[PDB]
C-alpha cells in the first residue's frame, strides 16, 4: 500500500523509505501491523503538528480575556506559557488527549462504526463518535457539526492525501519553531520571536522533578 | 407523547419555527425509560418551568417595587429598596424552607399515583396529562379549594379552548423562562440585557443561593 | 439555478464580460448540498450585499451630509460635523441592537421556508428565486405594508420588466458595493480613492466591522 500511496502523494519521487522502516517488522507484528501503526502515527504527528503549528501562531499574539488565560503575556514563547499554566491545567489536558486516544484505540466501538485497529486493516485515522459514551454527547470530535458528513468519496481520499502531505509540511514547521525557541539561530530567517530556555519536552519540569534525574 | 405528537404540538404553537429540537433531548432515553415517557417528563418540565418562570416574573416586577403584604412582620422586618433577588436573601430562612416545603407537598401531591388515577388521569411518564395537577379529593383532611382553579371558573371549558390555552402556556412558559432570567443577568451583570440598562437595580448575590446561611454546613433555627 | 443558467445571466448582466469566475465558486458544494444550491446561495449573497450596499450608499451621503429628520430628538441631539461611522458609533446601544434585531427577524423570516412554501416560494438553495422577501401574511398580528414594494407600485409590472430590473439590481449593486467600500476605505487609509480627496471624506479612526 505504502508505494501506490507514495506515488499518489508525490509521483515524481515515488517511494523513499531510505531506513526501510517498513521493511523492519515492528514488535514482530508482522510487515503489514508496520505499515499500518507507520500510517497511523504519520497522521498522529500530522494532525497534531497542524494543530500545533495553528495553535502556536495564535498563541504568540492572542490570549483569552478571562483568567487564567488573561494572567499570561502573548509576548513570551508558547512554550513557556505552557510552563507556567497551573499543574491541574496540564494534567487535565493532558487526560483529555488520553482519553480521545484510548477511545481511539478502542477496538469495539471503531467496529461498531464498521473499522478495525490501525494495524489490523484498519483505515489510518478513522477516528469513532461518541455514541458508545453514557450520558449525553452533543457534538463529536470528526465533523461536529455534520457538515461534510455526506462528502465525496474521491475527495474522501484527496483529502487523505492533502492531510498526509500538510501534516509532513506541519512536522517540519512547528520544530523548527521549537528549534528555534530553544536555540537561538536554530532556523535561520525564523529568529524574530520568543527565545525560551527550557525543555519542551518537560509538560511538569515548572511543577515537579522526578526521582533519580 | 409520542415524537410525531411533539412535532404535531410544536407546528401548533408555531407553525413557521416547527420541531425545533437540536440537541435531542426527545431522543436521548431519560433513565432507560421509553421515548414515550421521555417526552411526558420533557414536556412536564418545560410546562414546571414555564409557570414557575411566569410566576417569577410577575413577582419579580412586585419585589422591585415593594408592593409588599400590608398585615405581615416578615415583610417590614425586610428592609425596603432592597433588589428584588435582596428581598429573598433578607427573609428569615424558616420561611424560605416553608415556602420550598410547601412546594414540595404540592408536587409530591401532583405526582401520586393514585390521586391521580382516582381523579382519572394518570402520571405524565405514564402516558397521561403533562402539566396537570389533581385536586385535593383523596386528602387526609378536607381543604376548601384545589390548587388549579380552587375558584369555578374553566369547569365548563370546551377541549377546543383548553388546547389553545395549553399551547399558550407552553409559549408564554418559554418567554416568561427568558424574561425572568434577563431580569436576573441584568441585575448580577450590568449591560447583559441591552434593553434594562439603568432599570434593573444591581445586585452582589447568588440567586441559585436560596438560604443567606449555608444549610450543608452552618443553618439556622427558629 | 444551473450553470449554463448562471453562464447565460452573466451574459446577460453583461455581453461583454461573459461569466468571469476567477475563482469558480460557483463550481463547488458549500456544506456538502448540490451545485444548484451552492448557486443560490452565491446569488442570493450577492443580491443582498448589493442591496445593502445600496442602502448603504444613500445612507453615508445622507449622513455625511448631516441630513437629519425634524422629529427625532436623539439625532437632533447627536453632535453634527461627524463622520457616518461616528455617528453610527454614537447612536445609543439599545437603538443599534433594534436596528439589528429588526434585520435579524427579517432575516429569520426570509429564509423560514414554511412562508416561503405558504407563498409559493421556496428557500434559494433548495430552488427558487434568489432575493424574494416573502409577505407578512402568516404574523401573529395582521401588519400593514410588506417589506417589498408596501404600497404597491410594482403589483401590474410585466415578467420581461421584473427579469429586467433584476439584472439591474444585481449589477448596480455589484457598483454599490464598490461605492460604499471606497467611502469606508477613504475614511480609513487617505488616498486609498482618488477622487473622494476633494470633497473631504470625513475620517474614521476605528474598525467599523467591531460593534
Ligand atoms: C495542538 C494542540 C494544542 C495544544 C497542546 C495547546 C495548548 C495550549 N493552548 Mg491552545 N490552541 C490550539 C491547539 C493547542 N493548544 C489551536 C489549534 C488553537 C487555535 C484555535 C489554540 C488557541 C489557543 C489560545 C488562543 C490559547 C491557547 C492556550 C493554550 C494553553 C491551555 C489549553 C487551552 O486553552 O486549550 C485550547 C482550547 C481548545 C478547545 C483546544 C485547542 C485544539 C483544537 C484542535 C481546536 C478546535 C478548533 C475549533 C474550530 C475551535 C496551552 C498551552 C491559552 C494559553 O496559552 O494560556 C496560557 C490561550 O490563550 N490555545
Ligand atoms: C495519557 C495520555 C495518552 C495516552 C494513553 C496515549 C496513547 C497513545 N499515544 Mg499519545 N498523546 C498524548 C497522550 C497520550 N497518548 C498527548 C497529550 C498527545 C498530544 C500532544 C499525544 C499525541 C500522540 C501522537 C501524535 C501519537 C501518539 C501515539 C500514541 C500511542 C502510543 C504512545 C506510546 O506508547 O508512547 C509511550 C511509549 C497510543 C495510542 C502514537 C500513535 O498512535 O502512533 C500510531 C502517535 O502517533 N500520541
Ligand atoms: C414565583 C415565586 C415567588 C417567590 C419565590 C416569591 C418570594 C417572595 N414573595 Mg412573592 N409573589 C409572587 C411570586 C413569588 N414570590 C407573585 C407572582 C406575586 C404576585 C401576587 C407575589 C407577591 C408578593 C407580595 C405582595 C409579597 C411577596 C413576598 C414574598 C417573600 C415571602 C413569601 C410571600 O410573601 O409569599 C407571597 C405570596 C403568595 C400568595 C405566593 C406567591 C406565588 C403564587 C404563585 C401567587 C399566585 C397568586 C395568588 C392568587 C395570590 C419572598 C421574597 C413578600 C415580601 O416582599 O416580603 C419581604 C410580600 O409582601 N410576594
Ligand atoms: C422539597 C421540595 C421539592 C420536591 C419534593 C420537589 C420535587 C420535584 N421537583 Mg422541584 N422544586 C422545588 C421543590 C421541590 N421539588 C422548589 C421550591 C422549586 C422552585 C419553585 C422547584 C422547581 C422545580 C422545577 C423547575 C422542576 C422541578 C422538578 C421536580 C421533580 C424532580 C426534581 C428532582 O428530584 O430532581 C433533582 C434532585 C435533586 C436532589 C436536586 C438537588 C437538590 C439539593 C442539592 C438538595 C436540597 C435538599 C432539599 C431542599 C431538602 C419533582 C416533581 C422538575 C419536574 O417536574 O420535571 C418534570 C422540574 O422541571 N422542581
Ligand atoms: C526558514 C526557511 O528557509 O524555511 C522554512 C523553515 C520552517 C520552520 C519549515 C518554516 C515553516 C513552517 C511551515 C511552512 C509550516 C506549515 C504548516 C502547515 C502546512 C499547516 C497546516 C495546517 C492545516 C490545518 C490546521 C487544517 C485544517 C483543516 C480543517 C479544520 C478541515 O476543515 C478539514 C477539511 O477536510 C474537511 C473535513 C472538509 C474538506 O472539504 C476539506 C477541509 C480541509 C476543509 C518557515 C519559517 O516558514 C520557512
Ligand atoms: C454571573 C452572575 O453574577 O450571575 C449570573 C449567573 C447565575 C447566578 C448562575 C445565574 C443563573 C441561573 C442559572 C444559570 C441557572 C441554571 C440552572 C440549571 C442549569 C439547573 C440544572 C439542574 C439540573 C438537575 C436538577 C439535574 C438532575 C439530574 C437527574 C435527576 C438525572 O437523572 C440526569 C440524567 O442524566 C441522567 C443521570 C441519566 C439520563 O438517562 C437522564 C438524565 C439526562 C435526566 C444568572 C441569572 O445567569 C446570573
Ligand atoms: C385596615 C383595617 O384596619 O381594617 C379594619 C376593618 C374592620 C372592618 C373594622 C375590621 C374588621 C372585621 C373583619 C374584617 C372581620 C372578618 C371576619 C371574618 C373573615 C371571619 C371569619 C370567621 C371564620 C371562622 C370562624 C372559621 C371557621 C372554620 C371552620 C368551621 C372550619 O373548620 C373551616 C373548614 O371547613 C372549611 C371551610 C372547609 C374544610 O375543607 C376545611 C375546614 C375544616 C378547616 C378590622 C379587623 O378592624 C380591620
Ligand atoms: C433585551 C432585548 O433586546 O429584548 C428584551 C429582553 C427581555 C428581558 C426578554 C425583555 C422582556 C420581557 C419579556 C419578554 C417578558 C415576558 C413575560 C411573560 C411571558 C410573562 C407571562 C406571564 C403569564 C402569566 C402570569 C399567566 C397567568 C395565567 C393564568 C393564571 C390564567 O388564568 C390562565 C387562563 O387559562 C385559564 C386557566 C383560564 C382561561 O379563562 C384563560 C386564562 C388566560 C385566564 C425586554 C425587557 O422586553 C427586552
Ligand atoms: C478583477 C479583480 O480585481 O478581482 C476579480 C477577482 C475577485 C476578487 C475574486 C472577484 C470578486 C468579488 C468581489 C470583488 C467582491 C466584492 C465584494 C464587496 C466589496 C462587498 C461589499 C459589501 C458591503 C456591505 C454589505 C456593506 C454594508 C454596510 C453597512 C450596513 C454599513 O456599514 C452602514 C453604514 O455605512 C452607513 C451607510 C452609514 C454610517 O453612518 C454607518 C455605517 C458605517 C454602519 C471578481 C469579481 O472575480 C474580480
Ligand atoms: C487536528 C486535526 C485534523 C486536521 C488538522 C485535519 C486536516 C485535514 C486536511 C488538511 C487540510 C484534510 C484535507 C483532511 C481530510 C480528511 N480528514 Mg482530517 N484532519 C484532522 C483530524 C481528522 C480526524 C480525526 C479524521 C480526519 C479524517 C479525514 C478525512 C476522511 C476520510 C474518509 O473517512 O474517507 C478526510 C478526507 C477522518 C479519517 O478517518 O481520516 C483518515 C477522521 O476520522 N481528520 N483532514
Ligand atoms: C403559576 C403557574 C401558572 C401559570 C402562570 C399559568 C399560565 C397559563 C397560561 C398563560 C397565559 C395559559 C393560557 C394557561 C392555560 C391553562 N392552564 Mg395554566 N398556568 C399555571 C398553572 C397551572 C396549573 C397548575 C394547571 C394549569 C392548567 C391549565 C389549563 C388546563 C388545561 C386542561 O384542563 O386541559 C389551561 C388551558 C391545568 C392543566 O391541567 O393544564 C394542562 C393545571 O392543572 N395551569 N395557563
Ligand atoms: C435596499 C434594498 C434594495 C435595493 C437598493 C434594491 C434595488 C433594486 C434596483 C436598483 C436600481 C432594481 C432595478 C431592483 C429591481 C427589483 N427588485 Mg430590488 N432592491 C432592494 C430590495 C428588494 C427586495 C427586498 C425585493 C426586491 C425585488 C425586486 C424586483 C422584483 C422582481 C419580481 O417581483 O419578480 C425587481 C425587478 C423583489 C424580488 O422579488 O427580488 C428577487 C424583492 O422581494 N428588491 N431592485
Known amino acids: ?213 | 407523547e409520542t415524537k410525531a405528537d411533539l412535532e404535531a404540538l410544536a407546528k401548533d404553537l408555531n407553525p413557521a419555527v416547527g420541531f425545533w429540537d437540536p440537541l435531542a433531548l426527545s431522543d436521548y432515553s431519560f433513565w432507560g425509560t421509553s421515548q414515550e415517557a421521555t417526552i411526558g417528563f420533557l414536556r412536564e418540565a418545560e410546562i414546571k418551568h414555564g409557570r414557575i418562570a411566569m410566576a417569577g416574573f410577575v413577582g419579580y416586577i412586585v419585589h422591585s417595587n415593594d408592593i409588599r403584604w400590608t398585615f405581615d412582620k416578615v415583610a417590614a422586618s425586610v428592609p425596603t429598596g432592597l433588589p428584588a433577588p435582596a428581598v429573598w436573601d433578607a427573609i428569615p430562612d424558616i420561611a424560605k424552607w416553608q415556602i420550598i416545603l410547601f412546594v414540595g407537598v404540592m408536587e409530591s401531591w401532583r405526582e401520586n399515583k393514585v390521586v391521580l388515577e382516582a381523579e382519572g388521569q394518570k402520571h405524565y411518564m405514564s402516558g397521561g396529562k403533562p402539566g396537570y395537577f389533581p385536586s385535593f379529593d383523596l386528602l387526609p383532611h378536607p381543604v376548601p379549594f384545589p390548587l388549579f382553579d380552587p375558584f369555578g371558573i374553566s369547569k365548563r371549558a370546551t377541549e377546543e379552548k383548553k388546547a389553545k390555552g395549553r399551547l399558550a402556556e407552553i409559549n408564554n412558559g418559554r418567554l416568561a423562562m427568558i424574561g425572568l432570567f434577563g431580569f436576573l443577568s441584568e441585575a448580577t451583570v450590568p449591560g447583559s440585557v441591552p434593553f434594562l440598562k439603568g432599570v434593573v437595580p444591581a445586585y452582589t448575590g447568588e440567586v441559585m443561593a436560596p438560604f443567606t446561611q449555608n444549610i450543608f454546613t452552618a443553618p439556622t433555627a427558629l | ?211
Open chain 1, 1 to 213: 500500500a505504502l508505494p501506490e500511496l507514495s506515488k499518489k502523494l508525490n509521483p515524481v519521487l515515488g517511494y523513499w523509505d531510505p531506513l526501510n522502516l517498513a521493511e523492519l517488522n515492528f514488535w514482530g507484528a508482522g510487515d503489514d501491523a508496520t505499515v499500518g501503526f507507520l500510517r497511523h502515527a504519520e497522521i498522529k504527528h500530522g494532525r497534531v503538528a497542524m494543530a500545533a503549528f495553528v495553535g502556536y501562531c495564535v498563541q504568540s499574539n492572542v490570549h483569552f480575556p478571562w483568567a487564567p488565560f488573561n494572567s499570561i503575556p502573548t509576548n513570551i514563547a508558547p512554550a513557556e506559557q505552557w510552563a507556567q499554566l497551573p499543574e491541574a491545567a496540564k494534567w487535565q489536558i493532558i487526560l483529555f488527549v488520553g482519553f480521545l486516544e484510548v477511545y481511539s484505540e478502542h477496538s469495539f466501538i471503531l467496529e461498531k462504526y464498521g473499522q478495525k485497529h490501525y494495524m489490523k486493516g484498519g483505515k489510518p485515522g478513522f477516528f469513532p463518535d461518541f455514541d458508545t459514551m453514557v450520558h449525553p454527547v452533543p457534538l463529536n470530535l470528526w465533523d461536529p457539526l455534520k457538515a461534510y458528513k455526506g462528502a465525496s468519496a474521491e475527495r474522501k481520499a484527496d483529502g487523505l492525501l492533502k492531510e498526509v502531505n500538510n501534516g509532513r509540511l506541519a512536522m517540519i514547521g512547528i520544530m523548527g519553531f521549537c528549534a528555534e525557541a530553544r536555540v537561538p539561530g536554530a532556523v535561520p530567517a525564523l529568529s524574530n520571536i520568543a527565545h525560551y530556555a527550557g525543555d519542551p519536552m518537560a509538560p511538569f519540569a515548572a511543577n515537579f522533578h522526578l526521582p533519580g534525574f
Open chain 3, 1 to 211: 439555478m444551473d450553470k449554463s443558467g448562471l453562464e447565460g445571466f452573466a451574459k446577460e448582466l453583461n455581453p461583454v464580460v461573459g461569466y468571469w469566475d476567477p475563482l469558480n465558486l460557483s463550481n463547488g458544494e458549500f456544506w456538502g448540498d448540490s451545485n444548484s444550491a451552492t448557486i443560490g446561495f452565491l446569488r442570493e449573497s450577492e443580491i443582498k450585499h448589493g442591496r445593502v450596499a445600496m442602502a448603504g450608499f444613500v445612507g453615508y451621503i445622507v449622513h455625511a451630509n448631516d441630513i437629519r429628520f425634524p422629529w427625532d430628538k436623539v439625532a437632533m441631539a447627536a453632535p453634527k460635523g461627524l463622520s457616518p461611522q461616528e455617528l453610527w458609533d454614537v447612536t445609543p446601544e439599545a437603538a443599534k441592537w433594534q436596528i439589528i434585531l429588526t434585520i435579524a427577524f427579517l432575516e429569520f423570516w426570509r429564509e423560514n421556508s414554511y412562508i416561503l412554501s405558504k407563498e409559493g416560494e421556496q428557500h434559494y438553495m433548495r430552488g427558487g428565486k434568489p432575493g424574494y422577501f416573502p409577505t407578512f401574511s402568516e404574523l401573529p398580528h395582521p401588519v400593514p405594508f410588506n417589506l417589498f414594494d408596501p404600497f404597491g407600485f410594482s403589483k401590474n409590472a410585466s415578467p420581461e420588466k421584473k427579469a429586467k430590473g433584476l439584472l439591474a439590481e444585481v449589477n448596480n449593486g455589484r457598483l454599490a458595493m464598490i461605492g460604499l467600500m471606497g467611502f469606508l476605505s477613504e475614511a480609513k487609509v487617505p488616498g486609498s480613492v482618488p477622487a473622494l480627496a476633494n470633497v473631504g471624506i470625513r475620517p474614521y479612526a476605528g474598525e467599523v466591522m467591531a460593534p
